[PDB]
């Protein structure tokens, strides 16, 4: 079978993926530049992620096509072509980790968020992560490689010049680097951390919603205790529990409804301590009207805000999960190649499928923003309509 036939299918699919990765991710960068509502710290890591996916199409995919032919080259030039995609993958992992951490600070410590994370600190984090991605991804160029033990029967068979090798990924890149150092330490470990962070995000959002409902019930229940009461101290008990639940839900038109709320509680408590119970019970049914006009409005707005952040955290978790789905097959195949020297090597068509799948990850993110983030979707339309004209 002419190898150029099967090679044509692999090359054609890769070029198709490159065009889509470039187009969709250029659109993401254009949206963030145009719409000032999208220019926040979270979306700067989105742009950093988009830039890495753009470079997959412009450089990594052409590099992959080149190395599939086994052309003769100087071994260290082959190493750079083979290892550059590892830089872009490491950059993606760092950007995903930052987005998870940024979303956790937003829900856990919302008050200091705007003081903690700033636009100028995010840019410096992004630059540091990119430098580290080059260091991790190009570590084979520092000596941990197979350039010292060339396959010379292959180089002679392909007619390579002196000092050249047949440029093949598994011939120059050691598999102990790929498995122990790249997969376990630099990919799997950061992915598990992301898993734990998102676990803390959804647990903390659940507890906050429950606390709000508990205070809402604590307020309403102790109101009925007052109505159907008989002694002055019972009135005092129910009221004091309301004052605590009133201050533990305060964490300007809201401050009014809370200024009134704590005020009416204070009036009714003074009546009970003096002993006038009937006057206290009646000074309480006014607390009702306060809740049906101010408190319930706050409880709804706070509840609607929390759900908006959970939605935004769910969207980021889908992006991280799709990364794992597209990259794990290739990594798992490397484990079989490395750990089972008695097993037959995975066939070539499966290698190409796992490689293509890892490249598909650079296409999917712009579809997630359009489906799940309304501000992205509207901005997308505006660009397409005003430039398809």
Ligand X SMILES: CCCCCCCC/C=C\CCCCCCCC(=O)O
Ligand Y SMILES: CCn1c(=O)c2c(nc(/C=C/c3ccc(O)c(O)c3)n2C)n(CC)c1=O
Ligand Z SMILES: CCCCCCCC/C=C\CCCCCCCC(=O)OC[C@H](O)CO
Q: Choose the binding region for Na ion from 36-44, 86-94, 121-129, 195-203 (rule: CB under 5 A).
A: 86-94
Total site size for ligand CLR, rule CB under 6 A:
17
84 contributes a contact to ligand Z by CB under 6 A: no
185 contributes a contact to ligand Y by CB under 6 A: no
Contact with ligand Z (CB under 6 A): which of 9, 123, 233, 325? 123
351 binds, among ligand Y, ligand X, ligand CLR, none (CB under 5 to 8 A by kind): ligand Y
Provide the token pair at 162. 């002196």
Cα distance between residue 249 and residue 252, in whole Å: 15
Provide the token pair at 318. 């889908």
What DSSP assignment string belongs to 108-140? Answer: HSHHHHHHHS-HHHHHHHHHHHHHHHHHHHTGG
Contact with ligand Z (CB under 6 A): which of 21, 31, 48, 294? 48
Long-range contacts of 93-96 (CB under 8 A, 24+ apart): 93/186, 93/187, 93/190, 93/191, 93/323, 94/129, 94/132, 94/133, 94/190, 95/45, 95/46, 95/48, 95/49, 95/52, 95/126, 95/129, 96/49, 96/190, 96/194, 96/319, 96/320, 96/323
What DSSP assignment string belongs to 50-97? Answer: HHHHHHIIIIIHHHHHHHTTT-EEEHHHHHHHHHHHHHHHHHHHHHHH
Query: Is there a contact between 362 and 21 (Cβ–Cβ < 8 Å)?
Result: yes
Binding to ligand X by CB under 6 A, coded x per residue (else -) over 322-341, reads --x-----------------
73 contributes a contact to ligand CLR by CB under 6 A: yes
Pick between residue 73 and residue 271 the one whose CB is nearest to ligand CLR.
73
Dump strand ranges (E) for the chain: 72-74, 164-166
344 contributes a contact to ligand CLR by CB under 6 A: yes
Total site size for ligand X, rule CB under 6 A:
60
Hey, which residues between 132 and 151 contact ligand X (CB under 6 A)? 134-135, 138, 141-142
β-sheet bridge partners, residue 164: 74
Total site size for ligand Z, rule CB under 6 A:
9
349 contributes a contact to ligand CLR by CB under 6 A: no
Instruction: Please give the biggest Cα pair distance in the chain.
Output: 106
130 contributes a contact to ligand Z by CB under 6 A: yes
Hey, which residues between 275 and 334 contact ligand CLR (CB under 6 A)? 328-329, 332-333
Contact with ligand X (CB under 6 A): which of 127, 185, 210, 244? 127
Hey, which residues between 70 and 109 contact ligand Y (CB under 6 A)? 85
Residue 140: how many other CB atoms lie within 10 Å: 23
Give first-to-last CA distance, the chain, whole Å.
49
85 binds, among ligand CLR, ligand Y, Na ion, none (CB under 5 to 8 A by kind): ligand Y
* Integer angstrom CA distances of residue 329 from 1, 83, 131, 307: 27, 18, 27, 34
74 contributes a contact to ligand CLR by CB under 6 A: yes
Shortest reach from residue 31's CB to Na ion, in Å: 18
Burial of residue 108 (CB within 10 Å: 0-12, 13-18, 19+) is middle
β-sheet bridge partners, residue 166: 72
Q: Choose the binding region for ligand Y from 12-20, 45-53, 288-296, 347-355 (rule: CB under 6 A).
A: 347-355
- Residues forming the site for ligand Y (CB under 6 A): 64, 67, 85, 169-170, 178, 330, 334, 348, 351, 355
Residues that bind ligand Z (CB under 6 A): 44, 47-48, 51, 119, 122-123, 126, 130
Residues at the contact surface with ligand X, assessed by CB under 6 A: 4, 6-7, 9-11, 13, 16-17, 26, 29-30, 32-33, 39, 47, 51, 54, 58-59, 62, 65-66, 69, 71, 73-74, 76-77, 80, 123, 126-127, 130-131, 134-135, 138, 141-142, 191, 194-195, 198, 317, 320-321, 324, 347-350, 352-353, 356-357, 360, 363-364, 367
């Amino acid at each position: 079978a002419p190898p150029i036939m099967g090679s044509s299918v692999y090359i054609t699919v890769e070029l198709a993926i490159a065009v889509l990765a470039i187009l969709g991710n250029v659109l993401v960068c254009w949206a963030v530049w145009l719409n000032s509502n999208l220019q926040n710290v979270t979306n700067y890591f989105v742009v950093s992620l988009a830039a890495a996916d753009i470079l997959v199409g412009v450089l990594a995919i052409p590099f992959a096509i080149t190395i599939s032919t086994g052309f003769c080259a100087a071994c260290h030039g082959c190493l750079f072509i083979a290892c550059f995609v590892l830089v872009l993958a490491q950059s993606s992992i760092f950007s995903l980790l930052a987005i998870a951490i940024d979303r956790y600070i937003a829900i856990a410590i919302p008050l200091r968020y705007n003081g903690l994370v700033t636009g100028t600190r995010a840019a410096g984090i992004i630059a540091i992560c990119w430098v580290l991605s080059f260091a991790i991804g190009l570590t084979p160029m520092l000596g941990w490689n197979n350039c010292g033990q060339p396959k010379e029967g292959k180089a002679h068979s392909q007619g390579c010049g002196e000092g050249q090798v047949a440029c093949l990924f598994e011939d120059v890149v050691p598999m102990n680097y790929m498995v122990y150092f790249n997969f376990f330490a630099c990919v799997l470990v950061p992915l598990l951390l992301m898993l734990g962070v998102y676990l803390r995000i959804f647990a903390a959002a659940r507890r906050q919603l429950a606390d709000l409902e508990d205070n809402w019930e604590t307020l309403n229940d102790n109101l009925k205790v007052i109505e159907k009461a008989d002694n002055a101290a019972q009135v005092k008990d129910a009221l004091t529990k309301m004052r605590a639940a009133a201050l533990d839900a305060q964490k300007k038109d809201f401050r009014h409804g809370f200024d009134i709320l704590v005020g009416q509680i204070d009036d009714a408590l003074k009546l009970a301590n003096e002993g006038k119970v009937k006057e206290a019970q009646a000074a309480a049914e006014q607390l009702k009207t306060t809740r049906n006009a101010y408190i319930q409005k706050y409880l709804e707005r706070a509840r609607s805000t929390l759900q908006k952040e959970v939605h935004a955290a769910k969207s980021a978790a889908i992006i991280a999960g799709l990364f794992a789905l597209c990259w794990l097959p290739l990594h798992i195949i490397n484990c079989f190649t490395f750990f089972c020297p008695d097993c037959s090597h995975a066939p070539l068509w499966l290698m190409y499928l796992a490689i293509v799948l890892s490249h598909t990850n650079s296409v999917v993110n712009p579809f997630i923003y359009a489906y799940r983030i309304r501000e992205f979707r509207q901005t997308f339309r505006k660009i397409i309509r005003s430039h398809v004209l």
